[PDB]
Amino acid sequence: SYAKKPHISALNAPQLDQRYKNEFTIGAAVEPYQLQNEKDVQMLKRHFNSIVAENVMKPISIQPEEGKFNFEQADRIVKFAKANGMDIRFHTLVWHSQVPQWFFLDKEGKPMVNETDPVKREQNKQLLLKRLETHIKTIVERYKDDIKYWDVVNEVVGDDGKLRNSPWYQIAGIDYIKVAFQAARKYGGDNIKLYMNDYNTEVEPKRTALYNLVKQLKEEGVPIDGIGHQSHIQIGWPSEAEIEKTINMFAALGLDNQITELDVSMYGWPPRAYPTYDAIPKQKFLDQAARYDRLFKLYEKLSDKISNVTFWGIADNHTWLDSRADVYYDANGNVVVDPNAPYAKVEKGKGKDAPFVFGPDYKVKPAYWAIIDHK
Ligand SMILES: OC[C@H]1O[C@H](O)[C@H](O)[C@@H](O)[C@H]1O
Numbered sequence: 001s002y003a004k005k006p007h008i009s010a011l012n013a014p015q016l017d018q019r020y021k022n023e024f025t026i027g028a029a030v031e032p033y034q035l036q037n038e039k040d041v042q043m044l045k046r047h048f049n050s051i052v053a054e055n056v057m058k059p060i061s062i063q064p065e066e067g068k069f070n071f072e073q074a075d076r077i078v079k080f081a082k083a084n085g086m087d088i089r090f091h092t093l094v095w096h097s098q099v100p101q102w103f104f105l106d107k108e109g110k111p112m113v114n115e116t117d118p119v120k121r122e123q124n125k126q127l128l129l130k131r132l133e134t135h136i137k138t139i140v141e142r143y144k145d146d147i148k149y150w151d152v153v154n155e156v157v158g159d160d161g162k163l164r165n166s167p168w169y170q171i172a173g174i175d176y177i178k179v180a181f182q183a184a185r186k187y188g189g190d191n192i193k194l195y196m197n198d199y200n201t202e203v204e205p206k207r208t209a210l211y212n213l214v215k216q217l218k219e220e221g222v223p224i225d226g227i228g229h230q231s232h233i234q235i236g237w238p239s240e241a242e243i244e245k246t247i248n249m250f251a252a253l254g255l256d257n258q259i260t261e262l263d264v265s266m267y268g269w270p271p272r273a274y275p276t277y278d279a280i281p282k283q284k285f286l287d288q289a290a291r292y293d294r295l296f297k298l299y300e301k302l303s304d305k306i307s308n309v310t311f312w313g314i315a316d317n318h319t320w321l322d323s324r325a326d327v328y329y330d331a332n333g334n335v336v337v338d339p340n341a342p343y344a345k346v347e348k349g350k351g352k353d354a355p356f357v358f359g360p361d362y363k364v365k366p367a368y369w370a371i372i373d374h375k
């Protein structure tokens with residue numbers, strides 16, 4: 001069926017977002033440079049009705065120096081979204097990754113994490129939480145009328161099932177998460193939706209840890225409207241059953257669910273990638289299409305619990321997964337894709353992955369036909 005369909009140009013193909021109207025919006029992560037790209041722009045206007053900044057709205061991009069906010073790139077994304085009636089998601093207000101280090105220096109300029117005096121630690125905590133509020137207030141007040149969905153905190157639970165021990169936690173403990181949400185609500189109003197975003201939300205012990213955390217926060221009156229599931233998944237993992245169990249679990253707490261950074265990798269973990277996009281055989285696109293078919297069939301079934309599904313990219317010509325696309329080589333210098341085969345060396349991030357339902361040349365892939373139809 002969808003496997004025999006023609007690989008027509010995606011630029012004029014049936015609109016993806018329209019196919020899912022009344023079920024959930026369809027979004028894409030974007031980089032400013034793409035807004036100056038003829039085809040990326042066409043793709044956005046054509047298939048998507050929700051947009052998120054892939055990188056220009058993260059903490060270090062907004063306030064790399066205390067008191068100096070750089071909204072130039074962010075403004076460009078928001079402006080484009082408004083001009084095209086697209087919903088907007090804010091790519092995290094708090095995150096341990098690439099966090100501006102100045103946040104964690106005490107009044108004297110010393111690393112807060114080194115402080116041992118409980119009273120000085122309390123003082124440092126107040127300073128950090130104050131900075132956190134200023135950061136959130138400035139951003140939220142600037143975009144509250146345009147950006148409705150917000151990833152207030154990102155990846156705050158470790159993969160070991162424990163709260164991520166980042167400087168935020170080491171210094172302020174669990175309170176940095178409570179303050180982030182409360183600050184967002186206070187300065188953003190009751191109309192914006194606040195989310196806790198993370199990856200591997202379907203995997204234990206992370207899933208239950210995440211569950212308990214949000215359950216306790218809500219019990220304490222902390223304003224959190226939903227969970228963001230990054231969904232950096234593979235062809236057969238996590239299973240649809242676990243994804244469904246995960247979605248229902250959180251919806252049961254009265255939380256909204258949004259697939260925030262969806263991409264269906266062609267590989268496992270650790271990934272053994274193909275060296276180039278052309279090296280990827282049709283067979284791989286067929287297994288991927290079958291997965292996408294099951295995936296969006298499950299999402300529709302749960303449409304009452306999912307308000308948005310965003311892809312972490314537009315088309316296969318641009319995806320952060322290439323940075324993870326390690327190419328393995330045997331002793332004879334030949335590529336090794338078989339995950340169980342022996343190898344000699346590894347060329348990290350030199351390969352290519354193909355995530356999406358749209359190829360590098362902006363043509364629809366089998367995966368597209370699989371989620372565009374009603375079968
Ligand atoms: O953060 C990246 C990785 O995290 C976990 O190890 C996942 O199992 C793996 O698939 C990948 O998502």
Ligand SMILES: OC[C@H]1O[C@H](O)[C@H](O)[C@@H](O)[C@H]1O
Binds near residue numbers: 097230320
């Ligand atoms: O969303 C997850 C992903 O986002 C960006 O692509 C970053 O560069 C990656 O390191 C990872 O944090």
